[PDB]
Design a protein. Structure first.
Ligand SMILES: CC(C)CN(C[C@@H](O)[C@H](Cc1cc(F)cc(F)c1)NC(=O)O[C@H]1[C@H]2CO[C@H]3OC[C@@H]1[C@H]3C2)S(=O)(=O)c1ccc2nc(NC3CC3)sc2c1
Lengths: 99, 99
């Protein structure tokens, strides 16, 4: 699809057998999802944003389907206020910025 | 231009007579710039992100040239770690997401 930016670019994702909505975020290097139940091993990590830092759990090689496109990569799980799809996955679905 | 997302989508902007670099950010509702000297009158505001909140000064009807495109609108100024061009200005330069 082509997505204009008059509203938030929200998309439906499927991850770990659950359905969620997430923001396509070109300003995010990594993908960060709200607290959710994800199978497998994870490694502790701290990431920084506009207001300071949060601790997250890093899961690698996680399959996500983003608006019908499959991708595999790293997902961070923690107290983000919104689910964010970052550039590590945006590149895999072929997403580009155009103006 | 068409911008792919293997690197941060950084762009050169001119605002308040100064040249800066800023991140094209589809996950940002509003435009937030690092501390900088802007001429107008401002209004205190508080915005939320990944790690909490920061206090910013809001300036309205500020002219910004973004990769050669002119836009006018609200700019928030404060302790963000990165200059962020948000959707209030991305829509004015015709920016879309495509995949
Ligand atoms: C969290 C998003 C949902 C919102 N944000 C934009 C994201 O694009 C940030 C951009 C950013 C990049 C940085 F490098 C550093 C930063 F400080 C900020 N991305 C990020 O936090 O990424 C982080 C983490 C994610 O992976 C890596 O990539 C970068 C790092 C890192 C770990 S925002 O900044 O908080 C924002 C902007 C405008 C705005 N307008 C408002 N208006 C009111 C509602 C009416 S609310 C509001 C909120």
């Amino acid at each position: 699809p082509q997505i204009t930016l008059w509203q938030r670019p929200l998309v439906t994702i499927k991850i770990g057998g659950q359905l969620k909505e997430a923001l396509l975020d070109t300003g995010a290097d990594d993908t960060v999802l709200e607290e959710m139940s994800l199978p497998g091993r994870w490694k502790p990590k701290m990431i920084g944003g506009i207001g300071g830092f949060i601790k997250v759990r890093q899961y690698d090689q996680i399959l996500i389907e983003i608006c019908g496109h499959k991708a595999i990569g790293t997902v961070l799980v923690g107290p983000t206020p919104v689910n964010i799809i970052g550039r590590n996955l945006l590149t895999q679905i072929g997403c580009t910025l155009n103006f």
